[PDB]
Design a protein around this ligand. Structure first.
Ligand SMILES: [Cl-]
Ligand SMILES: [Y+3]
Ligand SMILES: [Y+3]
Ligand SMILES: [Y+3]
Ligand SMILES: [Y+3]
Lengths: 45, 45, 45
């Protein structure tokens, strides 16, 4: 059982790294959109 | 103890699925905003 | 081994809370950008 628990923990950790990588990508795209809205607002005002 | 560990792992996995679902929703809304900034920019230029 | 598993689970849970906090922050900034695109569109139309 301890063994199956150990391999399950590795699969949860693997998934956590995939999630972390997805968040990093989202954060950068989100920062690009914030910059984009800023230039558009500055141009129309 | 192995038992409590097993039920704890299920709660961590449950939480991981909730996180995954939240990211999927964020990704789609983020893609809608990127499209939105694109139409606004195209219209003002 | 059960012991190392227990401390590993706590580290996975710690990481899950950091992820949850990051998502909450992303969600609020994403809602600010949606509001921003709305005001810009309303102004140019
Ligand atoms: Cl956005
Ligand atoms: Y292994
Ligand atoms: Y169970
Ligand atoms: Y402990
Ligand atoms: Y997680």
């Amino acid at each position: 059982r301890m063994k199956q628990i150990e391999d399950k923990i590795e699969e949860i950790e693997s998934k956590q790294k995939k999630i972390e990588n997805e968040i990093a990508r989202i954060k950068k795209l989100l920062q690009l959109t914030v910059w984009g809205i800023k230039q558009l607002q500055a141009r129309i005002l």
